[PDB]
Amino acid sequence: RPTLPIPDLLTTDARNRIQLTIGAGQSTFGGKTATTWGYNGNLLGPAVKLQRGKAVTVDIYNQLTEETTLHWHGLEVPGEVDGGPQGIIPPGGKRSVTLNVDQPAATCWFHPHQHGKTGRQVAMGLAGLVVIEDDEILKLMLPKQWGIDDVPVIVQDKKFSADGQIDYQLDVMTAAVGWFGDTLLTNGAIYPQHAAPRGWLRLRLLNGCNARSLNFATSDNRPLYVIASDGGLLPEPVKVSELPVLMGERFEVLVEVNDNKPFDLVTLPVSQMGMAIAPFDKPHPVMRIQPIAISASGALPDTLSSLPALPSLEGLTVRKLQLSMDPILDMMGMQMLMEKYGDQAMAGMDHSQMTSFAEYWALLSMNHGGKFDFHHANKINGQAFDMNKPMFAAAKGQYERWVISGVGDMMLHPFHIHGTQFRILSENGKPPAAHRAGWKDTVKVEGNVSEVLVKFNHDAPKEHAYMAHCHLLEHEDTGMMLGFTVKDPN
Amino acid sequence: ETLVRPKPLLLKLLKSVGAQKDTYTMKEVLFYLGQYIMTKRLYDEKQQHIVYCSNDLLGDLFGVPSFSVKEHRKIYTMIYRNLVVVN
């Protein structure tokens, strides 16, 4: 097995500014050469060590023939730095931002964020981690040896053409169920192998698939100890037998290495439309851990951090967002899927869900024009994305109850809100799981309703607006996303 | 919107459910037609995008014994054959 790659950790130079170049180039998957992209690389980019309260500047240089963005997924920073409208870097271009970090130590990432292009630009290889350190977490004595017992694990699926090149297509099927493939890339590698000390192994897991949700576990069923979520540490470690992770979410887990017993990290088959076709019908290996006589470094504390109380939940401005996949898109996408893969497709959510004759006929009558441009078929609140109108203005420094509905379709909708770390009160109609009570920047929405308590501490204008979107990328690209603004009330 | 005149046999099928007019809008035909199918059991209880008209008057109208309420443009072309568009 090939040895797992470790993204270069990236602090500042004499001038506290990090340099990131957005290039293309070549990578090799199972001996077939493909064209891939990357931040300071052929592939996937680096880990940007940031230090809370101490700011740094980032020059972003774009050596693609085409344009792209750079979203700091998980950061509490003004809508300026994201950019939004005219936050676009044109080919050969420069952009410079400053990141004054103010949020607890956390494992965030960055990825291209342009409505219409995110799906493909990500699929190409653009990704990259941000590692935030505060003083609290250093005083903690977690495993700290980057690339040894503290390991980024970026897990992604891709599909490849006959050529060995990446095969993306934003057709009506991938706009419906997502772009998903058959080859699983752990930090870019296929089934790599990592060499761990005996002791605790810290793994910063990141689901970077386009639509594929993952569900981590170990080949031999040792528990994973979750110690942090999207936005930072949990209060105490949550012991779990399996860890489902959605697109763009991160969890830092600890695992125990004792004997020379090797064992794989695996992702278990998941109850999601189109994600339990072979080879993901069965448990699938993410990477193999092999223990050797390397130095260990950390412990599994019984407390990790303090977490503030929640403010009384009335008086709080409340906003309902209702996600909606245009029903024609659903019917059609599922036809493409039910043809291509037999009925091994819907396996996992395959049961009594049906659709009446009256619904079918009302669908017929409704697109009498035969005008069905599926590039706006996904909507929040009834209308798809238009950069022109931020949907609303929410208050700075103020607590608010956002309620995201997803009733009417059974399509997974991991829902992302920029410029904040928030807390989940309801996640798809149930109270959040023990480890998703933390800080999160993504919420499951699958046929039901979630409610999050959110507060933005950073200004964002119509010019550079915050977003909110499904992080199933092909949904975000085909309309399921809005903008919003935040300013200190006049 | 769009206003139309049902050719004879379609008009016949249209009044079997309670229509009375001689010149309808499109949404009006779609309504009464779906009403006809759901009154005469014509869909299959299990797969109910599937309409079985072989032995019915609708079978002669459309010229088939079956069709699927998913193939929209096809069912529209069958509908428009028995129409005279007035605009």
DSSP letters spanning A363-419: HHHHTTT----GGG-EEETTB---TT--SEEEEBT--EEEEEE-TT------EEETT
Instruction: Specify the 3-state DSSP secondary structure of A289.
Output: strand
> Is the distance from CB of A250 to CB of A206 less than 8 angstroms?
yes
- Which among B26, B38, B48 has the least Cβ separation from residue A368? B26
Provide the token pair at A183: 């080859």
DSSP letters spanning A130-151: EEEE-HHHHTT-----BTTTEE
Q: Residue A376 annotated as binding?
A: no
Which residue in B has a C-alpha nearest to residue A335's C-alpha? B70
Pairing relation of β-strands A183-186 and A189-190? antiparallel
Q: Is B31 on the interface with A (CB under 8 A)?
A: yes
Consecutive H or E run containing B62: helix B57-62
Q: Domain span at residue A26?
A: 1-133
DSSP A434: G
Consecutive H or E run containing A123: helix A118-124
Instruction: Please give the Cα distance from B41 to B38 (Å, whole number).
Output: 5
Q: Please give the resolution of this entry in Å, rounded to 1 decimal.
A: 3.3
> Is the distance from CB of A71 to CB of A111 less than 8 angstroms?
yes
Contact across the interface for A368 and B27, Cβ inside 8 Å: yes
Nearest-Cα distance to chain A for B49, in Å, is 6
Q: Indicate the number of domains in chain A.
A: 3
Asked if residue A484 and residue A418 are part of one domain, the reply reads yes
Asked if residue A322 and residue A209 are part of one domain, the reply reads no
Asked if residue A97 and residue A40 are part of one domain, the reply reads yes
> Is the distance from CB of A126 to CB of A68 less than 8 angstroms?
yes
> Is the distance from CB of A229 to CB of A108 less than 8 angstroms?
no
Interface probe with A: pick from B33, B46, B48, B85, most Cβ of A within 10 Å: B48
Contact across the interface for A357 and B26, Cβ inside 8 Å: no
Asked if residue A157 and residue A110 are part of one domain, the reply reads no
- Kindly calculate the radius of gyration of chain B based on its CA atoms and give it in whole angstroms: 12
Provide the token pair at A461: 């204008």
Q: Is A355 on the interface with B (CB under 8 A)?
A: yes
Q: Is A371 on the interface with B (CB under 8 A)?
A: no
Asked if residue A386 and residue A351 are part of one domain, the reply reads yes
Q: Is A338 on the interface with B (CB under 8 A)?
A: no
Instruction: Specify the 3-state DSSP secondary structure of A305.
Output: coil
Contact across the interface for B30 and A365, Cβ inside 8 Å: yes
Interface probe with B: pick from A330, A332, A338, A357, most Cβ of B within 10 Å: A357
Secondary structure string (H, E, C) spanning A441-464: CEECCCCCEEEEEECECCCECCCC
Chain B hits for A363, CB-CB cut-off 8 Å, are 69, 72
User: What CATH number is attached to the domain comprising A46?
Assistant: 2.60.40.420
**Bridge partners of residue A19, in order along the sequence:** A59
Instruction: Please give the Cα distance from A448 to A427 (Å, whole number).
Output: 9
Which residue in B has a C-alpha nearest to residue A358's C-alpha? B34
CA end-to-end span of chain B, whole Å?
Answer: 10
Asked if residue A404 and residue A333 are part of one domain, the reply reads yes
Contact across the interface for A370 and B73, Cβ inside 8 Å: yes
Asked if residue A290 and residue A154 are part of one domain, the reply reads yes
Contact across the interface for A368 and B70, Cβ inside 8 Å: no
Asked if residue A275 and residue A195 are part of one domain, the reply reads yes
Instruction: Please give the Cα distance from A35 to A12 (Å, whole number).
Output: 29
Asked if residue A147 and residue A44 are part of one domain, the reply reads no
Asked if residue A116 and residue A146 are part of one domain, the reply reads no
Asked if residue A418 and residue A288 are part of one domain, the reply reads no
Q: Residue A418 annotated as binding?
A: yes
The count of other CB atoms within 10 Å of the CB of residue A87 is 20
> What technique solved it?
X-ray
Which residue in B has a C-alpha nearest to residue A356's C-alpha? B48
Burial of A445 (0-12, 13-18, 19+ CB in 10 A): buried
How many angstroms from the chain centroid is the CA of residue A457?
22
Nearest-Cα distance to chain A for B33, in Å, is 10
Asked if residue A293 and residue A237 are part of one domain, the reply reads yes
Instruction: Please give the Cα distance from A352 to B87 (Å, whole number).
Output: 44
CATH number 1.10.245.10 given to B1-87 = yes
- Smallest CA-to-CA distance from A260 within A280, A235, A289, A227 is with A289
- Smallest CA-to-CA distance from A65 within A36, A91, A96 is with A91
- Smallest CA-to-CA distance from A190 within A155, A152, A160 is with A155
Compute the CA torsion angle B30, B32, B35, B41 (nearest 10 deg). Answer: -90
